Every structure is written in structure tokens, then in C-alpha cells.
PDB file of C-alpha atoms and ligand atoms in Angstrom:
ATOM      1  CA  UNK A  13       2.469  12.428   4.516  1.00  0.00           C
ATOM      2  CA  UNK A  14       5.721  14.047   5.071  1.00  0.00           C
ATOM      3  CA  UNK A  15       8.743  13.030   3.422  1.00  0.00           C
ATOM      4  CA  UNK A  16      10.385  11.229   5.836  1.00  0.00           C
ATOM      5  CA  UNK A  17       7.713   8.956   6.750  1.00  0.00           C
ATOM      6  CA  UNK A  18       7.344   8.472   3.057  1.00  0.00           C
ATOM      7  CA  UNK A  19      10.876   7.663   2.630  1.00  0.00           C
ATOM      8  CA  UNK A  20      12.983   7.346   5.391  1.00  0.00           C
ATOM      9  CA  UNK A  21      14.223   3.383   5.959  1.00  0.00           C
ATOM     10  CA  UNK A  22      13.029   1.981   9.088  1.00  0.00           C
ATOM     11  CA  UNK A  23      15.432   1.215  11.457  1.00  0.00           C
ATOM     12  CA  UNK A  24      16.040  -1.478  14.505  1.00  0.00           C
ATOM     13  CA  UNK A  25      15.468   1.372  16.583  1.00  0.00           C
ATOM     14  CA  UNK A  26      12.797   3.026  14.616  1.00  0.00           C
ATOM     15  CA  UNK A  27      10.952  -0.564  15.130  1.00  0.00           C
ATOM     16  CA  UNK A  28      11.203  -0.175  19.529  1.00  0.00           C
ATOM     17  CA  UNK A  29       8.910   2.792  18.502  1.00  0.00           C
ATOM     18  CA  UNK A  30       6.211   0.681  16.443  1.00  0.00           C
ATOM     19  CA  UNK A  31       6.452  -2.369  18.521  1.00  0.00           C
ATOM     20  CA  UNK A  32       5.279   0.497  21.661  1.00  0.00           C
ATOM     21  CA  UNK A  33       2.350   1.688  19.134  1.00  0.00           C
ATOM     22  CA  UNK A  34       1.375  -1.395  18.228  1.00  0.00           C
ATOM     23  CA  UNK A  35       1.228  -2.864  22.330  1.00  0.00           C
ATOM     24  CA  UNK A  36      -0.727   0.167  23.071  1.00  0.00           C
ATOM     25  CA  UNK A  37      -3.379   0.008  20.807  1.00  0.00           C
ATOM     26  CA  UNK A  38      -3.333  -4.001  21.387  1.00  0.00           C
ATOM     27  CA  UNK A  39      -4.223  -3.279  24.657  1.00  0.00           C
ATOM     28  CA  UNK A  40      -6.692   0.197  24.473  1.00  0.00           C
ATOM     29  CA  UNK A  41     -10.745  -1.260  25.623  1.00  0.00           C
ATOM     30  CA  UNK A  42     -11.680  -0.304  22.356  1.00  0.00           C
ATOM     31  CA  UNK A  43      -9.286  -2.307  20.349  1.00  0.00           C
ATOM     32  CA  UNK A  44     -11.070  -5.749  20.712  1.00  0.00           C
ATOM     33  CA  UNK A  45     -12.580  -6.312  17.398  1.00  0.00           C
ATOM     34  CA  UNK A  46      -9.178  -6.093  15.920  1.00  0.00           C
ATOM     35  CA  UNK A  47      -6.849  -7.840  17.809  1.00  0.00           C
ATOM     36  CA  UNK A  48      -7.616 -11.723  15.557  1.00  0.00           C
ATOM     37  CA  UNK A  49      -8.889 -11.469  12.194  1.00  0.00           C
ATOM     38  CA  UNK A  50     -12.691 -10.942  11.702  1.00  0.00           C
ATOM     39  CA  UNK A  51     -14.353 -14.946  12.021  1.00  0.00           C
ATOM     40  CA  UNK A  52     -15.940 -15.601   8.505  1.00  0.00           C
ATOM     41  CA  UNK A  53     -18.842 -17.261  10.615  1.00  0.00           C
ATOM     42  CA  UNK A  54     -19.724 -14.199  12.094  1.00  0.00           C
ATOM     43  CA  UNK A  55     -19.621 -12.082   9.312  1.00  0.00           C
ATOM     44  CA  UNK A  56     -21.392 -12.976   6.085  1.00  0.00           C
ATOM     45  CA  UNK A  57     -19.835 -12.489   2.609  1.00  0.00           C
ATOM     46  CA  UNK A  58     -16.758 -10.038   4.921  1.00  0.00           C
ATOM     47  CA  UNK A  59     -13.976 -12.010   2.588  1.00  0.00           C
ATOM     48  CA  UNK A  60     -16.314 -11.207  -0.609  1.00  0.00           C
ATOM     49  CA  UNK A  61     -16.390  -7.481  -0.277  1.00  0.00           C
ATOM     50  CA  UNK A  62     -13.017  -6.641   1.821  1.00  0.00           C
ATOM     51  CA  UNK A  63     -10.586  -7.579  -0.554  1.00  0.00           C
ATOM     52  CA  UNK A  64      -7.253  -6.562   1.943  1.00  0.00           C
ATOM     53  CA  UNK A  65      -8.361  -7.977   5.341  1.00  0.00           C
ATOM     54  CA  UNK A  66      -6.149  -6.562   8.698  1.00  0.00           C
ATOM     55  CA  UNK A  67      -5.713  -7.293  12.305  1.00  0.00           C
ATOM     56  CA  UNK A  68      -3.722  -6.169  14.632  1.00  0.00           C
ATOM     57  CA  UNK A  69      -2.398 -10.183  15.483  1.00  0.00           C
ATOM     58  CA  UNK A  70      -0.834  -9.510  11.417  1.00  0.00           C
ATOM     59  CA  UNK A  71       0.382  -6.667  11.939  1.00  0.00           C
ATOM     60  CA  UNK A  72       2.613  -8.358  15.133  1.00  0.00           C
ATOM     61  CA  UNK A  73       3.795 -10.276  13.140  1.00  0.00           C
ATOM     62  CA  UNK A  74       5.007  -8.437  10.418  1.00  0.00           C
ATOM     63  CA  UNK A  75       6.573  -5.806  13.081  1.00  0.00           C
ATOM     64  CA  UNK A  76       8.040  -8.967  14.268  1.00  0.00           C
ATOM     65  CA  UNK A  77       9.430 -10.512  11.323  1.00  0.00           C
ATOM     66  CA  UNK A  78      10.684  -6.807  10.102  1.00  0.00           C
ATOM     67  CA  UNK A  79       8.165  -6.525   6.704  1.00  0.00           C
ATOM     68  CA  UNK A  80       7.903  -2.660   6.799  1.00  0.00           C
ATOM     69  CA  UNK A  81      10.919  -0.915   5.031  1.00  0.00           C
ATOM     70  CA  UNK A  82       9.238   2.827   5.124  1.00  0.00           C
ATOM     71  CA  UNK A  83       6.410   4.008   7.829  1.00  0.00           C
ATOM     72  CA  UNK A  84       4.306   4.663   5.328  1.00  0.00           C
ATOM     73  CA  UNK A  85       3.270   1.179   5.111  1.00  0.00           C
ATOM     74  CA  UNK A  86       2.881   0.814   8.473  1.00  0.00           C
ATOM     75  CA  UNK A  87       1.000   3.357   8.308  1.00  0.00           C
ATOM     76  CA  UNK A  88      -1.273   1.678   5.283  1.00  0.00           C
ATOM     77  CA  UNK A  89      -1.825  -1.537   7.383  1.00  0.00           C
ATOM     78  CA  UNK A  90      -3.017   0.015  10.690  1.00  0.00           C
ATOM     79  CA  UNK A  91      -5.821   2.306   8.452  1.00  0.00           C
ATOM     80  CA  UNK A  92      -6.909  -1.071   6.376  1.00  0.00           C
ATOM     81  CA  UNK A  93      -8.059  -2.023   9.521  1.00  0.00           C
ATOM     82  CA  UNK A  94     -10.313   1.178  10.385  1.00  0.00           C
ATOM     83  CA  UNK A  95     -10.969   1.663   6.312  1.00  0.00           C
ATOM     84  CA  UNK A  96     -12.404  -2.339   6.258  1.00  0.00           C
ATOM     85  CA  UNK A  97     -14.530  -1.751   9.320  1.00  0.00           C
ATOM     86  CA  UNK A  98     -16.078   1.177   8.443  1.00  0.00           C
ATOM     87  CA  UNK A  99     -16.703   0.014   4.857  1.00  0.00           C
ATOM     88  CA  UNK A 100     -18.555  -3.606   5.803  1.00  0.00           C
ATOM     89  CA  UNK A 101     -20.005  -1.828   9.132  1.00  0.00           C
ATOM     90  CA  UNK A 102     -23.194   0.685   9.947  1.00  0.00           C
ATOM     91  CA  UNK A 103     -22.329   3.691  10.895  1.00  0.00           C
ATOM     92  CA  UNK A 104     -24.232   2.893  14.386  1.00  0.00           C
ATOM     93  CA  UNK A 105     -22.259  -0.448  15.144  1.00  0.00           C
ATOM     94  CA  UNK A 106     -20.297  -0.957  18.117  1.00  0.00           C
ATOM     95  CA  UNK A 107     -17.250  -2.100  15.324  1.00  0.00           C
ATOM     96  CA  UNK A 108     -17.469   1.000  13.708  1.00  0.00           C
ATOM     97  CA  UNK A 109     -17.389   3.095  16.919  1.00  0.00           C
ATOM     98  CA  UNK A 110     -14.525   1.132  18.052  1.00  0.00           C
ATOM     99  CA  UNK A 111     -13.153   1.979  14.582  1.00  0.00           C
ATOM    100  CA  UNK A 112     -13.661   5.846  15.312  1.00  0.00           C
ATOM    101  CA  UNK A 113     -12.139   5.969  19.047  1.00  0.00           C
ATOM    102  CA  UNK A 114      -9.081   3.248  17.940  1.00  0.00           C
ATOM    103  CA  UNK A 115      -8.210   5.540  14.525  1.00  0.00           C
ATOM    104  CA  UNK A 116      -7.855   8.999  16.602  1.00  0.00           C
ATOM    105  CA  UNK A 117      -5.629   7.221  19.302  1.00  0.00           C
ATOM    106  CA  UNK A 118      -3.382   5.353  16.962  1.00  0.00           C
ATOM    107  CA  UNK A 119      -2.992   9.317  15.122  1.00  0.00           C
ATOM    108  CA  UNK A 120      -1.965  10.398  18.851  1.00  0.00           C
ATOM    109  CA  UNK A 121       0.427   7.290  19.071  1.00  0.00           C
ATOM    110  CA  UNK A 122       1.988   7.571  15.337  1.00  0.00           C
ATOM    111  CA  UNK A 123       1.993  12.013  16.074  1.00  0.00           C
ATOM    112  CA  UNK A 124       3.877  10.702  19.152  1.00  0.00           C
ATOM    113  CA  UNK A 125       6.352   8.443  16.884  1.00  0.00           C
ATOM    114  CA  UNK A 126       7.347  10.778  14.250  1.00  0.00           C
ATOM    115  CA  UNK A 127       8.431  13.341  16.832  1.00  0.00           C
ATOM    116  CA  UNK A 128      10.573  10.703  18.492  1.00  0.00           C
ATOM    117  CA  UNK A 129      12.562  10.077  15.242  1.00  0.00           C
ATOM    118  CA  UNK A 130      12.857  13.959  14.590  1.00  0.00           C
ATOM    119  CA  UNK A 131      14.981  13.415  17.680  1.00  0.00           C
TER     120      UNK A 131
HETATM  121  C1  7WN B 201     -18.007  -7.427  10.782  1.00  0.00           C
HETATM  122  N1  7WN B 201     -17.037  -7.618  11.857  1.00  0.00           N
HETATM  123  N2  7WN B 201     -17.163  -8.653  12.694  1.00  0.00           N
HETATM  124  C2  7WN B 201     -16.319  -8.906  13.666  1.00  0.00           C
HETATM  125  C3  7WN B 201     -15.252  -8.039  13.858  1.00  0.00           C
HETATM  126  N3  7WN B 201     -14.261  -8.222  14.881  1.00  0.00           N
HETATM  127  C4  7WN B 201     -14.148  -9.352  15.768  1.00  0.00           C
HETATM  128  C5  7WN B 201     -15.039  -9.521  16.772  1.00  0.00           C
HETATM  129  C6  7WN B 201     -14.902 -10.579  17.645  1.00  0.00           C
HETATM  130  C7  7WN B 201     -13.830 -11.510  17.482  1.00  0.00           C
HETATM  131  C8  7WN B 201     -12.974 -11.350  16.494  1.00  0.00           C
HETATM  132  C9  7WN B 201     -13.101 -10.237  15.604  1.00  0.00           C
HETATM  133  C10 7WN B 201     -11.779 -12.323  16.263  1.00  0.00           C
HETATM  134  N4  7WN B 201     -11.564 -13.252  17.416  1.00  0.00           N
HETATM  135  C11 7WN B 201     -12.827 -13.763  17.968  1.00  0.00           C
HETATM  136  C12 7WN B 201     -13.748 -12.651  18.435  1.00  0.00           C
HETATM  137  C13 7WN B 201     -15.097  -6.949  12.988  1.00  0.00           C
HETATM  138 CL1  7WN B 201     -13.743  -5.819  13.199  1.00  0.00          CL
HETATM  139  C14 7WN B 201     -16.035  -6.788  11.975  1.00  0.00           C
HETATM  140  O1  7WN B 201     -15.925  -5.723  11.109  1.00  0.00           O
END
């Protein structure tokens, strides 16, 4: 990562920018096993082996409630949620394949962001 996102304080305005990330991956068809956290019930011994769990609804909230001083932990949150998935998941499940499409458009989004505070 470069040094700004690294290091740079996040600002009020800063956080306009990852409130838009966040409500476009919220809303991206692909996104839907991540918007609540995974259900225990239908996923046996998930809160055994994934020791971080990550959703997008937590994430909202901490965007909300200002948590994230640097990007960099933004940044950490968003990939625990593709990094769980594809560690409890087959490579052929429909969660992991949502992981795959929802990682590479969130990289578009955050590209998108870091430009924007450049200028
Ligand atoms: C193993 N597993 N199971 C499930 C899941 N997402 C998921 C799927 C459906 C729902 C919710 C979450 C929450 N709200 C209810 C519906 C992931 Cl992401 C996962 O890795």
C-alpha cells in the first residue's frame, strides 16, 4: 500500500468517499452474502474456524460511527470479508464466486477513491 493510504488521517470528507464505496458494493447483485453477518445455523462450526468475522451491515456502522482513523483499515475490513469466504468456502461455491466478482469491484471502487483524495 502506498503511503498515504497507510498513513494519511481520514477525514469528514475523506469519509463522503467510503460511505459512496461502501453503498455501491451494498447494492452490486453479487454482494448478497455479505450484506448481514453469515447465520451460525447455516453454516456449521463458521465461528470455530473464522476467528475475525465481517459484513458489510459492520462495516456501516463503523463508517457511521467514524472507527477508521487511516484507509488502511478500511481497507483490512472490506478484504476480511472476501479472505473469510474464501477460506470456509469451495472454490466452486456460489459464496466464493460472489467473493471473486465483489473483491475486483471494490479494487475498482477503492482505485477510484485514492485518486479522488490525490485531488
Ligand atoms: C458459509 N457462508 N454462509 C452464508 C454466507 N452469507 C449469507 C447468506 C445468506 C444470508 C446471510 C449471509 C445473512 N442474512 C440472511 C441470509 C456466507 Cl458469506 C458464507 O461464507
Amino acid at each position: 500500500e502506498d503511503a498515504m493510504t497507510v498513513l494519511t488521517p481520514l477525514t469528514e470528507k475523506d469519509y463522503e468517499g467510503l460511505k459512496r464505496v461502501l453503498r455501491s458494493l451494498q447494492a452490486h447483485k453479487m454482494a448478497w452474502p455479505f450484506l448481514e453477518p453469515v447465520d451460525p445455523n447455516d453454516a456449521p462450526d463458521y465461528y470455530g474456524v473464522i476467528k475475525e468475522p465481517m459484513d458489510l451491515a459492520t462495516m456501516e456502522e463503523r463508517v457511521q460511527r467514524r472507527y477508521y482513523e487511516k484507509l488502511t483499515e478500511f481497507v483490512a475490513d472490506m478484504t476480511k470479508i472476501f479472505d473469510n469466504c474464501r477460506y470456509y468456502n469451495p472454490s466452486d461455491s456460489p459464496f466464493y464466486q460472489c467473493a471473486e466478482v465483489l473483491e475486483s469491484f471494490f479494487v475498482q471502487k477503492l482505485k477510484g477513491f485514492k485518486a479522488s483524495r490525490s485531488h
